[PDB]
C-alpha cells in the first residue's frame, strides 16, 4: 500500500465492466471505489475473478500476500502479470509512459561510492608511456622478401625428401601390397596389437621440440583430395589400415605404457600417428617380400586432424582459379624455373596450406593484401609483419610459411604491382 501507485492504478481501469456495467476493477486508493469492511491486500480488486492486483516497479517487490496478483512494470516499457487478461489490460491502458517515483537510475550514487573511489585512488595507477616516432615510407620491395626467404632458408635448411608431403602421389603399389606394407611397418616399430588394431606406446618424452626444416615440393599432388578424405576418416576410425582408390593410410593411437592395465581405447584427447606411403628413394624406405615403399609419419592431435581432414581442396582450387593470373613454373625449392619448373607444384603448395593446422599462410596473405593496397607504411615495422617464424613451430608450418613468402616473391617478380 504505497501512494506512488495511486495514479498508476487510477488509469489502469478506466471503465472496465464485469457483469453488465459495474466496474470490474475497484481501486483501493479511492474511497468511492474501495470496498468497505474488508482489508486491503492489493492495489485493485477484480470482481469477476475476485482477485487482487498489485503494481510494483522492476525488481522492487511490495509487502503483499502471495495470493495477490503482482503486476510488475519493467523499465523498458513492458509490463507483467500472472493473468494474461490483466497483462493485456495494463499494456493497452498504459500506452502513456508515466514515470513513477522510486525507479533506480543508472547514474544512481550508492552509499559506498566514496569508499570505493578512495580504495581505487589508493590502488596503483599506470604511468604515461613514451610518444612514438613514426616514419612513413614506401612499402617493402622485392629485395626485402628475398632477404626474408634467404634468412629462413639459411636458418632452417631443407629436408632431403618431402616427407609426408610426398604422400600426395601414388606409391606404385596395389591395395593388397599397400595394406601388407603398412601392417608390416607397424609390426616392425614394435607397435602393440590389440583388438585387431595397432597402438603406439610411449613411456618417456625428451620434452624438446622436434627438428624442423623445409620440405621440398614434389612434382604434383593428384591425390590431395583422397589424402584429405583418408586423414579425416582415419583419426575417427583409428587402429586399422584405411584404403582409398589409389592410396591407403594407417592411423595408430598413441597412448602411455603404464603396465598390465595401461589403456585399451583412445580418448577424445588421444593423439594419432598417421602413416602414409610414397615412392621409394629416401631414408624412409621400407622393404618386405619384394615390395618397397617410402613410409612417412605425421603426429597429429585430434583438433589438428579434424582441421586438416575437413578442408575442401577441389573447391578451393576452383575458387582460386576463378580470378587468378598465370602461375609461373617453380622448382623444388620454390624458385622460379622457366626452363625445368612445373606449374603443378602450385597444387602441392595448396596441399601444404591444407596440411598446416597453424595456417600461417593466412597471416602472410593478410599482410600481402595490406602490402598491395598500401601506399605508405611505417618504417622498419611493416616489414617485420612478414617475420612469423617465432609465431610457429614445426616442419609443416615452417614449410608453409616459407612457401607463402616464396609465393609473394614470385608474384612480385612475375606480375609487379
Amino acid at each position: 500500500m504505497d501512494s506512488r501507485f495511486a495514479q498508476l492504478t487510477g488509469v489502469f481501469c478506466d471503465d472496465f465492466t464485469y457483469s453488465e456495467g459495474s466496474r470490474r476493477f475497484l481501486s483501493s486508493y479511492s474511497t468511492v471505489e474501495r470496498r468497505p469492511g474488508v482489508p486491503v491486500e492489493g492495489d485493485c480488486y477484480d470482481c469477476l475473478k475476485n482477485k487482487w492486483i498489485a503494481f510494483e516497479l522492476e525488481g522492487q517487490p511490495r509487502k503483499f500476500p502471495k495470493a495477490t496478483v503482482r503486476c510488475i512494470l519493467n523499465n523498458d516499457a513492458t509490463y507483467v502479470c500472472s493473468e494474461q487478461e490483466y497483462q493485456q489490460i495494463c499494456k493497452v491502458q498504459f500506452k502513456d509512459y508515466l514515470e513513477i517515483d522510486g525507479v533506480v537510475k543508472v547514474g544512481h550514487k550508492a552509499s559506498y561510492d566514496a569508499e570505493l573511489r578512495e580504495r581505487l585512488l589508493e590502488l596503483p595507477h599506470p604511468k604515461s608511456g613514451p610518444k612514438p616516432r613514426i616514419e612513413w615510407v614506401a612499402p617493402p620491395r622485392l629485395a626485402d622478401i628475398s632477404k626474408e626467404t634467404a634468412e629462413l632458408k639459411r636458418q632452417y635448411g631443407f629436408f632431403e625428401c618431402s616427407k609426408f608431403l610426398a604422400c600426395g602421389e601414388e606409391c606404385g603399389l596395389d591395395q593388397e601390397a599397400r595394406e601388407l606394407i603398412l601392417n608390416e611397418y607397424a609390426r616392425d616399430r614394435e607397435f602393440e596389437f590389440r583388438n585387431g588394431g595397432w597402438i603406439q606406446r610411449y613411456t618417456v618424452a625428451s620434452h624438446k621440440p622436434a627438428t624442423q626444416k623445409i620440405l621440398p615440393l614434389p612434382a604434383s599432388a593428384p591425390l590431395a583430395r583422397e589424402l584429405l578424405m583418408l586423414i579425416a576418416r582415419s583419426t575417427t576410425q583409428a587402429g586399422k589400415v584405411l584404403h582409398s582408390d589409389n592410396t591407403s593410410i594407417l592411423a595408430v593411437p598413441v597412448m602411455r605404457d603404464s603396465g598390465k592395465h595401461s589403456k585399451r581405447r583412445p580418448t577424445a584427447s588421444t593423439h594419432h600417428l598417421v602413416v602414409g606411403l610414397s615412392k621409394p628413394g629416401c631414408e624412409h624406405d621400407f622393404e618386405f617380400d619384394g615390395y618397397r615403399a617410402a613410409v612417412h609419419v605425421m603426429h597429429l592431435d585430434p583438433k589438428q586432424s579434424a582441421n586438416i581432414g575437413e578442408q575442401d581442396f577441389v573447391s578451393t582450387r576452383e575458387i582460386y582459379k576463378l580470378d587468378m593470373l598465370e602461375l609461373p613454373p617453380i622448382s623444388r625449392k620454390g624458385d622460379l624455373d622457366r626452363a625445368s619448373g612445373l606449374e603443378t607444384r602450385w597444387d602441392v603448395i595448396l596441399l601444404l596450406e591444407c596440411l598446416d593446422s597453424t595456417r600461417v599462410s593466412q597471416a602472410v596473405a593478410q599482410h600481402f593484401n595490406r602490402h598491395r593496397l598500401a601506399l605508405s607504411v611505417c618504417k622498419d615495422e611493416f616489414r617485420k609483419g612478414y617475420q612469423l617464424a617465432s609465431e610457429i613451430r614445426g616442419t609443416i608450418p615452417l614449410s608453409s610459411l616459407y612457401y607463402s613468402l616464396c609465393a609473394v616473391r614470385l608474384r612480385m617478380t612475375v606480375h609487379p604491382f
Binding site: 456495467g21 487478461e85 489490460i89 493497452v92 579434424a306
Partner: protein
C-alpha cells in the same frame, strides 16, 4: 527432493526465461567435432531415417519463384528487407493447430535484414536472396510509406535510403549542395546550378521544385538566368553515395542536413484497441454483447476472447 528445488535452491519462484535457459537444445555451433559426433552410434543415420519416415511427409509444398526483371550491374549498395511478424490471432491459431510454440513465438517480432547487393533495375526493386544477378524480385509492396519515415525523427521501418535511415537517395528525393560559390540542386533526373547576384536566385530553371525550396531556404527571389553554369559537379557521385541519417526532425524548410551546407528534400512533403487474448472460450466469463463498453468477452462470430479498451 525435486529437481526444481535442487536447481533453484532457496527460491520457490523463477522467471520463465531462466527456467527455459536451463533446457535449451536448439542451438547449433560449427565445430571441428561434427564428423565424429555424427558418426558416433550412427546418430545421423537414425535421424535421417526418422526424418524420411516420420517428418518428411509433413512439409508443405510451396511454390517456386517465377517473377524476375531485367537487371544490370551497378554500384554496391545496401538492401533492407522487412519481414513482418505474425499477428496475435495468427500466432494463437498456429499454436492451437499444434505447431511448435517456440518457433511461432520467435517469429512474432518484425525482422529487418541487411544485404549488400551490386545489381539494380530500372524500377529499383528488391531481389531474393542470391538471385539479384538473375533479377528475381520480392513482389511485395508493404505500403512503402517513406513519407512517414522522412518526417519522423526515428522512422519505424528503414527502407535502406537516406529518407528513412543510412543509405543513398531515392527517386522522389533531391538534394541541394553548395559547391564553392554555387548551389547544385539534383533530383536524380535533372541537375541545375543556382547563384545569387544581389538578392535573387539566378538559375536556368527557377520553376524547379528544388530551386523553389533553395530560394525559400535562402530567402531570395527566383530569377531566370541561363548564364549561370558550373565547371563540373559530383552530383551523380553524392546521389549514389550513402550518408548517415540524423535522428532529428525536418527543418521548417523541410530539409534535413546530410552534409556540409547540404540538405535533402522530399517532393511529396511540403476508438478501441480491440485485442484477441486467445482462440478459446474461458469458463466463467461474460458473453460478447452488442455494445461492450470496456470489458473482455467471448465472440461467437470468431471463437476468441476479445478485450475492448476505451
Amino acid at each position: 527432493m525435486s529437481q526444481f528445488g535442487k536447481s533453484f535452491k532457496g527460491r520457490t519462484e523463477v522467471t520463465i526465461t531462466e527456467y527455459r535457459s536451463h533446457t535449451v537444445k536448439d542451438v547449433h555451433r560449427s565445430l571441428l567435432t561434427a564428423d565424429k559426433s555424427l558418426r558416433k552410434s550412427f546418430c545421423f543415420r537414425n535421424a535421417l531415417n526418422q526424418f524420411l519416415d516420420k517428418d518428411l511427409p509433413l512439409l508443405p509444398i510451396r511454390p517456386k519463384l517465377e517473377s524476375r526483371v531485367a537487371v544490370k550491374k551497378s554500384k554496391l549498395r545496401s538492401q533492407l528487407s522487412f519481414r513482418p511478424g505474425l499477428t496475435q490471432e495468427e500466432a494463437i491459431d498456429l499454436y492451437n493447430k499444434g505447431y511448435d510454440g517456440d518457433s511461432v513465438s520467435g517469429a512474432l517480432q518484425d525482422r529487418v535484414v541487411n544485404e549488400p547487393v551490386a545489381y539494380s533495375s530500372a524500377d529499383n526493386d528488391k531481389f531474393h536472396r542470391g538471385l539479384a544477378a538473375l533479377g528475381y524480385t520480392l513482389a511485395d509492396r508493404a505500403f512503402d510509406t517513406c513519407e512517414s519515415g522522412f518526417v519522423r525523427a526515428i522512422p519505424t521501418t528503414p527502407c535502406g535510403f537516406i529518407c528513412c535511415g543510412p543509405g543513398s537517395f531515392k527517386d522522389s528525393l533531391g538534394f541541394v549542395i553548395k559547391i564553392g560559390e554555387f548551389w547544385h540542386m539534383y533530383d536524380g533526373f535533372q541537375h541545375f546550378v543556382a547563384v545569387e547576384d544581389a538578392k535573387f536566385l539566378a538559375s536556368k530553371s527557377p520553376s524547379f521544385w528544388l530551386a523553389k525550396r533553395l530560394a525559400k531556404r535562402l530567402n531570395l527571389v527566383p530569377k531566370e538566368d541561363p548564364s549561370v553554369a558550373a565547371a563540373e559537379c559530383p552530383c551523380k557521385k553524392v546521389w549514389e553515395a550513402s550518408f548517415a541519417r540524423a535522428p532529428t526532425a525536418l527543418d521548417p524548410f523541410g530539409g534535413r542536413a546530410f552534409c556540409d551546407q547540404g540538405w535533402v528534400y522530399h517532393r511529396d512533403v511540403g476508438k478501441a484497441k480491440v485485442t484477441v487474448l486467445s482462440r478459446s472460450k474461458w469458463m466463467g466469463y461474460e458473453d460478447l454483447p452488442q455494445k461492450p463498453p470496456n470489458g473482455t468477452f467471448y465472440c461467437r462470430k470468431r471463437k476468441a476472447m476479445l478485450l475492448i479498451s476505451c
